Design a protein around this nucleic acid. Structure first.
Ligand SMILES: CC(C)Oc1c(NC(=O)c2ccc(NC(=O)[C@H](Cc3c[nH]nn3)NC(=O)c3ccc(NC(=O)c4ccc(C#N)cc4)cn3)cn2)ccc(C(=O)Nc2ccc(C(=O)O)cc2)c1O
Ligand SMILES: [Mg+2]
Ligand SMILES: [Mg+2]
Lengths: 402, 517, 517, 402
DNA sequence: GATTTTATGCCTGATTCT
DNA sequence: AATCACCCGCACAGATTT
DNA sequence: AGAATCAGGCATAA
DNA sequence: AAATCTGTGCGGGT
């Protein structure tokens, strides 16, 4: 039961799909090339063969049906990859965490019970899309989140957007595109370091001039610098926090740090912009970007959107207004799963030979793969816990950020 | 057909699943002891206006709204999560008030979704207190269309009171309930003195307190669990031996059973045990439990001894069980093993943060309202020139410009402002140019716009006096709000008052009895 | 225990069931052509604010709301009813816009409730036009808690354009689709001449027009059906023969199939026929329909001719079908057999009633608004005494009594008040005591309350002029509404304008082709 | 086979229930007296044996299970009513039209296949309640709509209701009850004949005196009555209606042709009034009631309701006020089906031997019942259509006027 | 309205191995 | 997650009996 | 006789 | 070799 077979009988032009969920499989059975394609829905999560016993594996339902459909034997002295039906196998699971878990279980089954199938290259992984964007005439699918951001950036700067500084210059595209890309890169770098320092502290530094530690020495201009920084922070503060500054000359180069009291009613000891911070390349690139992002706007300015105009006095307002304008005649659909798609979308996105997109699974080194399988999917709790803790957020602390 | 090696795919996929399950499904939060599903369910039930003294709603409506809006998962899991919170014999303090058939201790199951009805319980409104006054942060839902709270501004110590149980990838958590009055006494004792040891805390918190009211046997395991975070305890049923003389044949009566045990499976297990000649001296077995309470009757053989047969039941049957206490919770988004003092300290810090943010919000609102009330009083003090000017105004904008670009005489109202001086009620964002300078008020754009939307109905005496009274009380409110932020002692006094009020409202008695071996 | 004869009980119960089903489930209403389930579903979707230019809603929402509130029957029937209205190949003009897997022309399936989405279509808003202006009568639901319309105030001739099909106890109904433009032209022709004959109507209405665009083979049954109400027609597929020369090969290509025929069953039937040797001259059969149009390819042997096999296909397989036209509908709560002229007359009478009721409601609203504006204009011309009196009074109630106490001289705004057509702009319920008396105006209570809520922003010149402009426009509107109610000829002009606008908005082209034998 | 058997082995004190639906079956199994009561839930509508062939009856599952449960054989040369089980059989279907249809199908099966069981009186019909009414302490169940209306009428006059007309009269119970009951009867009489005349005309004719045909004449007497009625109707409107009139003579009596128009540009052109209507007894009883129902209310009139007084005219609004006062502390629930009832209610309302009510099925005439069964349940459409039309609303339009 | 087997970690009892 | 297995009326192939 | 191995149950997810 | 008999499906209900 639950197996829609193909008409092709030669085992060199057939394919097999393992769709997750009953409704997704039912939808896929409609829109498929019935000549040389087959379907086999999986109801939910399947057995873990690494922990389980051989007899319990044979007694189960899903794995028994899969073994029967493949046609090869099972276990030693019967397994024989020569008599293989459905020479190409495709997974095509959901696009969320549970889909990845089911994918890992299926990979464990295939590698542990049938090595030569994996090694010869008869296993493929499918990549269905996530977003669908329509703009009246243009209609296209977009995968994951990064490509959505790229599409949004391209559409926002699509036509017009001839920024006017004072009277009528014209950046005209690529310069504005480079500025936008660099600013977004710096924003992404800033977002991944909020643990160490406040966001506002990093945001304010771009507009203010360079610290210039080379000529600072002990001129006592650090007092004026920190005073100006604190005054600017407190002028437009809108969360009740207060800031103070402190300076000292414990070394040849005078050091300074702010003290911030925030809504939590607890005060951090300090956030010193020490030698490492000024010497770090992060501050250098921040100053490089801020050099072009000083008060370039004059007293009068505006953004020249297509058949539109609006006075502006900051880059963030211009970006927000352009994004808001670009999202007028745009419609987006986000798929929660494979059950949201009609058969035609499935055919033209995952099952069409001339426009699908898949990955081939291969093996690099056998011993490393075997050790990894035993460590993760085994039945020993402590190695798995240690491995998960090793790759936790502590090991995610990458100082490159580039 | 880009290639990809097996090891990288396996590692990335499994690590993604493990992290998501660890920090998104199983372990609870130390500050309020709720998994994400509980928080989302309570928030969804609050948004619809499903208060504790209103008509019920079908469970299907609430489940559908929760799935559609905030929680992108199935329906059976969410409905079972709702059902478990509405059973008296599961939680110490129920969070949902239900009507229908929500199962029973005998082993039954609840009805389908389109047949039960639910609303919030009275205590649940304490968990979501002061939610609208910018006390906690919000995060986007899955598709970036709504907002959900990061953590509820709870007022009950929910984690210890209701406990928890969960199974994650690589670790698990299991914490038993407690009594509310004891926990609040412990919190107050901690607030009095921060150097209190575990011995001081255990004086006010002797031990757990289950809903089914069994007996706890032994005391070393509780101390070990509270000291290190991991321990084991023994739960025993309350049984008695009764004899009515005459024939001299005694009987065993059972009134209460341990936590998380089914009655029907217990009875059938005892029946099977006596069938196979494994337990001697049991003649008859009956269940009289209905309405009044739980009563199980066991009639023993004539020549047997009640104590001998009874002591075999604890060792053999499920009338004695072992509970393994193991505390794991999220501190700052990462799992950790906690003991009692860490939990209490975390709760106190949470309360301090919430009170501070609420006070700041109220101060800002009071200052903003006082700013408009001053302008309205000044305008009403000199109505005749104002209307005379307005009558010759070509348009509203010209009238607003004329009002802004001139001073006004304070008149007889300035004396009131002599009480309000010293820059107490001036908003922070206001510039020094505006406001009273030399006995001549200066108006802004917003004040003029507020003056323009004044109704004739407020020209009578009573409406005139109401504004003055409101201003007079607002001054005292602003003074009190400043005083609370001006020192640390007043904050702790406010927290003490809140805890005492909660204890008086929602306190109750003890059920489980603790005995030595 | 009380005896009962079997005959009486059987007769009573079966007659009760029959009279419930005949007027309750199966037969449609003549005026709007909707069974009760369709009306209830559309009303429920309308009340939720589920318009045609907003985000979709899950089918569970609509089905659950309909079951809970209005329609007390099973959910499978309601969901199938919703699904049937979303298929382009079932209704000529779809009423529900869906997203998901709503089936294919093969008659495959539809996904469950949780895996689809729906909203109202653009045309579906023309059926429910002017529903809020008291144009149709409401009746209670099954438990005396809600209200449901008795009939939709439709603007499209839904019954003819969309058709119907139903089975009842002792009778049935079957009406095919039609084209919108032809039917609208027929209605317009009828309005200009009420004594038109069937031959006159059929010039503008040649015949049916199915969604699938087959060929109708005959012209004799259509006239009989339109003249007496019962008839029969033959639907024929579209196919042709093509020759490649070379070796004299022939192939048969099928593009368009009849109405209500499955492609998969047809293909398998032809396969079985060739397999059992019942059809001679067919070599191979293939399907090549892909995203652009329907194509079925049949290859014929070299010792056979295409025409003979084609005619054998027509006579044997389901490529040619018979359709029995049988028109039955409810007129005034009784079944009745009808022809074309009766349906058109019923639609026109429905439009007349709807327009008259809408006009009366608009007239009432205009009169009330003009009545309030008169009081506002009178009050604006006596500013100084009004403000003096309001200031002197201590309480709003005393001010209200003082305002109502004495008359007010009209002043310089009396030019427009007297220019009104005596009592054209006077509400009916207003007593003769109030209104413009001999040179003085008397204020009611509600007029005084409206005066008290006047803002200071209204004293500017532009605001003063806008009220007079609004009043002068309202007078013209009232005059036009009176003229519309007066004569019986303006009403037909209004109806003609509405029908022409609908034709321009939603017109389209013909699909099915009619030919002689 | 969903059959829950009882303990009593003697087939002379047992009972069997044929419940509709699965929810009702589960509840009945929950709440039964387990000693001598059995349950057999029915999935849905069952086969019709009048139209079905004999061979198809044995293949079906529902009728086969029913035959097995009863224990007797089926068909000639095997049926044996002596060896019977469950001497009492109870139907107990739902309280809506579908339940009645299923009841008719079951009766057809029993009468056609097992005549002796029906003739000896082994088939009963249950009768569960419809409405539940609660008033704090006093709660009860009410069956059918007529009982609910009678209960409402009785509760409307539950003490108090001392009608003070002018100075101090008092009907004091029975007189008021008779007046109210007769008025309700006349209202029902008006409602049944509502189709052929407007409601307003019938509601106003009772206020008018008798026609007084004795003094009728072609001039100066025919016009006064019609003019008075038209004037009394025109000055009482809320829907922009209009009443007009004309009269004519035919050498026998002077007849009226009143006309009325509302929300339509068409005109009925006639609502004739002649000797036919006055000769009817409906107008006689209406005038008899109207003789009592005159302007008895003086400038002062009130009803001394229990610590409540509502001095008003237009006694219909007084009746409305009395109804509202009656419903001040009344709660009503209407069961949707048998499923809504919990097991205790089902036990105590229908299944209790000492508090249930039922009906016993018996056959009066055999040939007439056979003809009726053939006419209704046969597979001939035309006789059934003719029978349904004959007993249509035309047969319900009985001109007895009483 | 009524349909069915898995992952994940920690505690117990019951049962099998040298 | 779509499917169980019957009621109602009309019209037409294919299969049996006179 | 005492280690090693096997099953079932508790709460949110396919 | 004409005349009966027998199944299949269309759309809202248990
Ligand atoms: C309908 C009801 C639930 O809720 C509503 C709704 N509902 C929705 O608005 C809704 C809810 C959920 C969805 N969800 C989805 O669209 C996705 C799509 C998708 C695609 N791919 N994956 N998922 N599906 C899921 O999330 C999902 C995922 C997994 C599932 N199962 C499994 O994994 C599974 C489980 C076990 C096994 C095993 N062994 C195997 C597999 C399942 N579902 C959409 N819409 C709305 C209104 C109501 C309502 O008001 N009713 C009501 C009020 C009052 C009254 C009255 O008066 O009596 C009457 C009525 C209601 O009750
Ligand atoms: Mg998912
Ligand atoms: Mg029912």
């Amino acid at each position: 039961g639950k197996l829609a077979d193909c008409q092709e009988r030669d085992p060199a032009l057939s394919e097999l799909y393992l769709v997750e969920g009953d409704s997704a499989g039912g939808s896929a059975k409609q829109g498929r090339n019935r000549k040389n394609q087959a379907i086999l829905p999986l109801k939910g999560k399947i057995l873990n063969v690494e922990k389980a016993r051989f007899d319990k594996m044979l007694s189960s339902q899903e794995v028994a049906t899969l073994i029967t459909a493949l046609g090869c034997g099972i276990g030693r002295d019967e397994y024989n990859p020569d008599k293989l039906r459905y020479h190409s196998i495709i997974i095509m699971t959901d696009a969320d965490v549970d889909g990845s878990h089911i994918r890992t279980l299926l990979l464990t089954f295939f590698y542990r019970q049938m090595p030569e199938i994996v090694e010869r290259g008869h296993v493929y992984i499918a990549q269905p899309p996530l977003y669908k964007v329509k703009k009246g005439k243009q209609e296209q699918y977009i995968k994951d989140d990064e490509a959505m951001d790229q599409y949004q950036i391209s559409i926002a700067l699509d036509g017009a957007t001839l920024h006017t500084n004072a009277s009528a210059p014209a950046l005209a595209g690529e310069a504005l595109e480079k500025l936008v890309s660099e600013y977004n890169a710096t924003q992404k770098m800033i977002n991944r370091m909020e643990r160490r320092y406040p966001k506002a502290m990093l945001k304010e530094l771009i507009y203010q001039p360079t610290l210039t530690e080379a000529d600072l020495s002990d001129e006592q201009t650090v007092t004026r610098w920190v005073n100006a920084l604190v005054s600017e922070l407190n002028d437009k503060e809108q969360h009740g926090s207060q800031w103070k500054f402190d300076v000292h000359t414990n070394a040849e180069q005078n050091l300074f740090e702010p003290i911030v009291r925030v809504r939590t009613h607890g005060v951090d000891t300090d956030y010193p912009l020490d030698h490492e911070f000024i010497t770090g390349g992060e501050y250098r690139r921040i100053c490089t970007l801020g050099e072009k992002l000083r008060g370039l706007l004059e007293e009068d300015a505006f953004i020249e959107r297509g058949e539109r105009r609006q006075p502006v006095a900051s880059f963030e307002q211009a970006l927000d207004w352009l994004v808001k304008e670009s999202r007028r005649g745009l419609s987006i659909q986000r798929y929660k799963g494979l059950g949201e798609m009609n058969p035609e979308q499935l055919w033209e996105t995952t099952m069409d030979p001339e426009s699908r997109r898949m990955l081939r699974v291969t093996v690099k080194d056998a011993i490393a793969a075997d050790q990894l399988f035993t460590t993760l999917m085994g039945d020993a709790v402590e190695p798995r816990r240690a491995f998960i803790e090793e790759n936790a957020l502590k090991a995610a602390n990458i100082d490159i950020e580039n | 057909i880009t290639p990809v090696n097996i090891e990288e795919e396996l590692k990335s996929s499994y690590l993604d699943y493990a992290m998501s399950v660890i920090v998104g499904r199983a372990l609870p939060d130390v500050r309020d002891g709720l998994k994400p599903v509980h928080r989302r369910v309570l928030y969804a039930m609050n948004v619809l206006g499903n208060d504790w003294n209103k008509a019920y709603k079908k469970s299907a409506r609430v489940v559908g709204d929760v799935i559609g809006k905030y929680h992108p998962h199935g329906d059976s899991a969410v409905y079972d999560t709702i059902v478990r919170m509405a059973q008296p014999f599961s939680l110490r303090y129920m969070l949902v008030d239900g009507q229908g058939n929500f199962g029973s201790i005998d082993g039954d199951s609840a009805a389908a979704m389109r047949y039960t009805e639910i609303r919030l319980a009275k205590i649940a409104h304490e968990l979501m207190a002061d939610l609208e006054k910018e006390t906690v942060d919000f995060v986007d839902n899955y598709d970036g269309t709504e907002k959900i709270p990061d953590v509820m501004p709870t007022k009950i110590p929910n984690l210890l009171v209701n406990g928890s149980s969960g199974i994650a990838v690589g670790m698990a958590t299991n914490i038993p309930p407690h009594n509310l009055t004891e926990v609040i006494n412990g919190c107050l004792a901690y607030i009095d003195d921060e150097d209190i040891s575990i011995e001081g805390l255990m004086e006010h918190i002797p031990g757990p307190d289950f809903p089914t009211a069994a007996i706890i046997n032994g005391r070393r395991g509780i101390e070990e669990a509270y000291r290190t975070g991991r321990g084991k305890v023994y739960i025993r049923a309350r049984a008695e031996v009764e004899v009515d003389a005459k024939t001299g044949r005694e009987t065993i009566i059972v009134h209460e059973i341990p936590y998380q045990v089914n009655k029907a499976r217990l009875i059938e297990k005892i029946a099977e045990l006596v069938k196979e000649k494994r337990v001697e001296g049991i003649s008859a077995l009956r269940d009289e439990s209905d309405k009044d309470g739980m009563r199980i009757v066991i009639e023993v053989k004539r020549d047997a001894v009640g104590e001998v047969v009874l002591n075999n039941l604890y060792s053999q049957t499920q009338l004695q069980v072992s509970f393994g206490i193991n505390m794991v919770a999220l501190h700052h988004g990462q799992p950790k093993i906690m003991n009692l003092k860490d939990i209490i300290a975390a709760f106190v810090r949470h309360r301090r943060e919430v009170v501070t943010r609420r006070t700041i919000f109220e101060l800002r609102k009071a200052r903003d309202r006082a700013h408009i009330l001053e302008a309205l009083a000044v305008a009403l003090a000199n109505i005749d020139p104002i209307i005379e000017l307005i009558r010759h105004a070509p348009t509203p904008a010209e009238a607003k410009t004329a009002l802004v670009a001139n001073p006004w005489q304070l008149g007889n109202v300035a004396a009131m402002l002599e009480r309000a001086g010293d820059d107490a009620a001036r908003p922070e964002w206001l510039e020094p140019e505006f406001g009273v300078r030399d006995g001549l008020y200066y108006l802004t754009e917003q004040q003029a716009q507020a003056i323009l939307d004044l109704r004739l109905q407020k020209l009578t005496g009573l409406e005139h006096e109401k504004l003055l009274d409101e201003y007079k009380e607002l001054l005292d409110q602003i003074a009190e709000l400043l005083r609370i932020l001006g020192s640390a002692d007043r904050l702790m006094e406010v927290i003490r008052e809140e805890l005492e009020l909660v204890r008086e409202q929602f306190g109750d008695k003890r059920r489980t009895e603790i005995t030595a071996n």
